[PDB]
Amino acid sequence: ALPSIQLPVDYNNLFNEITDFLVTFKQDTEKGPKYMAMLQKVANRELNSVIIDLDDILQYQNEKFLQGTQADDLVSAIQQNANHFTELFCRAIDNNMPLPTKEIDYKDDVLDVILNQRRLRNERMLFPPNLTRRYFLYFKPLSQNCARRYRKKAISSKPLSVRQIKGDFLGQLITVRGIITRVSDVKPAVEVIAYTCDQCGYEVFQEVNSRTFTPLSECTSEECSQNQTKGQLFMSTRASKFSAFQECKIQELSQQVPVGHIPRSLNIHVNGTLVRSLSPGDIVDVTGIFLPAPYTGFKALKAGLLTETYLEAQFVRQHKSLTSDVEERVMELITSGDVYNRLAKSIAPEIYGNLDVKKALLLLLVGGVDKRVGDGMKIRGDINVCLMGDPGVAKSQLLKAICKISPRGVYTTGKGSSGVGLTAAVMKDPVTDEMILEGGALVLADNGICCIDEFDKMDESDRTAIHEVMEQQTISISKAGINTTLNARTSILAAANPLYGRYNPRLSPLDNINLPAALLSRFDILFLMLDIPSRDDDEKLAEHVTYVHMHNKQPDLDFTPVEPSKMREYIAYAKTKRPVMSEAVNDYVVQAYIRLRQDSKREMDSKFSFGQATPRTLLGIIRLSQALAKLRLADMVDIDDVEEALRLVRVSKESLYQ
């Protein structure tokens, strides 16, 4: 039949030592046992989880070694095998559960009502213990610090990868380092199922220890022993115990993959209060038990002796507001002074020059006023900045760098992927094969910045969305029978490449690029950065570039790089602020606009300028004054603010020659 083998481990002495450790253990550094305190805390319907530390277990072993009596190296037994010690510890907790000391508080708990109703009828006229349980038991991996303190080495907490997980580590407690890619919704998994039986005896309980089960549907009680055909069992959800279950996939980091290989993936299962600890896009260190999946059902026959695997998770270690602190940070930055120039300069300190562009990127980072006028009129406060110019002028570092500053931002590129206009209504998700409404990148960045690199090569299909956002900021959705309009208020940062190379003495700016005049008119600001050879500038550029290669540090200079978290804190605080205008300030704007138009009537010339001024220019003047006012000022806007905005616009306009 089944042969027998002798193994050193005996579970009786282990159980005795667990019972001794629960009572005796004290924190050496409230007084008394460490865990009977938290058990009493649990009994008062406040704590939902019990977490054991193997450092503490080593402390009990060290205490016993100080006494000198032999031990059973419980820490090694837990590491080698952990699926059984969970049940052992659960039984040990159940045996020594303290009484409720205060605030019994039975209000509307359905399971409580069922259990209380059971008592009267059972006594007047044995169930699975897990039904009465509420706490969840988790283990905590070892610490190298405590290990090195008492040697003994450590295996459970070592940050292995997905690839270093061999088949020799199955059934042990290990830790894996990786990035979370997919997380699923929370669903209930049955643990104890209760069937109601046509007022025959009473409801019956069955435990489920697999992913698949069979209903009972036959009443075996003493009163139900009567021979007449009477009916099968019906399930009752209220008297049954469920649990929260979640499954995730972790993927190997790019640094740890060897050359020529493709990264692998691992599956993680989490049950209990630990659910929702992991989200997509997080680099974490997850500890758990590595167990074999049954792989049954279809396609099991072909494998024969091949199994799946998964990791039952028990611990999570993620690697990486209005308060007086941030109230004082802004005051400190105000007392620092030179906020405008320093804020513009610290943006991408590697790149030397293009300081006006850095001023304009700051105004794009902040947003103008979005005022909802009555009778349906709306006015946009978002910023549309396009940066044109010859190749090899740092076109595509500037952009990427701006994406770092604001959390709400997406870097979308040419026809390699379609994300600008992918407001599709069909999503063939493999998990369920049903449609999901999937928004595009333009919709994704709300109150944010959309960085569209290589805008020249992008197709007219995305041009439709770009045209519509600047008009109404509300994306109409695909024609898959939903008729949905989605909010898409966003600011646009575009990078352009002139047609066939560099700037051309062809006079029309429309000839330099493919973009239509109407599309360019909606842009708030246009910047031309042409590469003109000058003997002085090349020397400083070469020196600046080569200093970075010689020493990895950027070239030290009197200019001080402000700390980036301060950048974010000031930018957010400015964004929260709401300006206001006065009647006197806007009167000078009319004079400015009429002077600009009287210039534009004669400004039509062979080479310089793009068409003529439009009322959209007046709108953008106020829109840009918004950000310059939000930068440091409040309440009414200064008159010199309009001068600053006009100066920035005029420099951008004069960039056509330069």
Added chain:
Amino acid sequence: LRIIWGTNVSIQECTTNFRNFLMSFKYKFRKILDEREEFINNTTDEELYYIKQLNEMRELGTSNLNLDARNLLAYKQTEDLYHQLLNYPQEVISIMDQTIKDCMVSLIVDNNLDYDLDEIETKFYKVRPYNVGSCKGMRELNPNDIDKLINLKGLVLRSTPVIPDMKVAFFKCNVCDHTMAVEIDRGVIQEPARCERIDCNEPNSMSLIHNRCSFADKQVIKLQETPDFVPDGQTPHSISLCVYDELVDSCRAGDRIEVTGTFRSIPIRANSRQRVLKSLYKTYVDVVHVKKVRQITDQDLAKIREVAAREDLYSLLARSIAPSIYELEDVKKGILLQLFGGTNKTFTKGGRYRGDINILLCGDPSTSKSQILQYVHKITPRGVYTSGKGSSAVGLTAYITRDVDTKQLVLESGALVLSDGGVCCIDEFDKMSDSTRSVLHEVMEQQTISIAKAGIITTLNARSSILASANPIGSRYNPNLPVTENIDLPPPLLS
């Protein structure tokens, strides 16, 4: 005294508390409850809000209630039901309907009138509670609140046709032809063993008559999590909703609704043939109340007449349609005249004569024509605002397309057919393709569109009005050159 098994709810006290609540409650107790200051007590304290709705429902005969949770908590003694309903919705609602059964009698015989009450006896009543508790999204739902009333919010994606549900089986005997009806409980049909007729009494002589049973209606709805609450780098989640009886065919596709209902979870089978089930349930909600996000009265007629008696009706609605637009009064005059349209006639001999006005706006590129079109879009009852930049060549007319959910054929009308009897606004008229332009030609000439594809040959009705806006080539419309060169439009289409 006796309590329904499992729960702690007893009918005896609940019925009495509810009748006390209904005959006792007023806005007085409600405004004492909320007491948020600046609370009006101007004769509202004695209005008897529940009794007046009860009487108006009795005289109308409709059965719809809007019982609220805060109002239910307002009364001190009935405060128990507030926490007794969240945990046991079904039994409390069963008591609800049973008490409303005699709520009619409690008021019909106060003056001993001659109401029949027999049609009241036959008809049944129910309730639609709302605002049960704090609204929480589907992203936060644990197994800890199964079979408890919740309030959810989400986007409607799709609906399914009516689903039959058996209520009363019907078995006939193939020998003696005897008919008997067997009720079904929770889906399972208890088969008749042998014919009840003692004389017939034959084993295995039963036949099911499918079309002689009794059925009820079901509908299933699909929801999606709203984009506002979703965090970064996530995919929206979905929930299925069960709708029964009068609430079927209420939620249109693409709307955003807040619903109240009972959370539930059921098992689904592992193997289709075997009895075996798998240890992971599916979660859904059974809904009880749904909320979203003609027949003009005589007073409206009188005010319409007196306003129509204004000295200058032309200029007033000239300025009303586009409040933001300054000057450009003449184009507003034309649009106001267009929105009414001349009379339409179709006499037998000559045929139909058109009664729609078509308007084309064009000129320098940075005027405000698009805002004008979006203004006239809203005023008109039925109309469509779609640009002519691209899309399918028959995107404004019928386009036979394969159905996505089912591998079937669906005939989908376009934007010109969907603007029948109204004003259809076209934007960016100059970018419309040479092949689709001809379609508009048959629309503006015969007002009908014919489709002949996939074995389908048919004609639809356009009968709409075209308001279009265009842009020239260049940054200005120089008056010296005539219209034709600048607008890039065929002479007949402009004509």
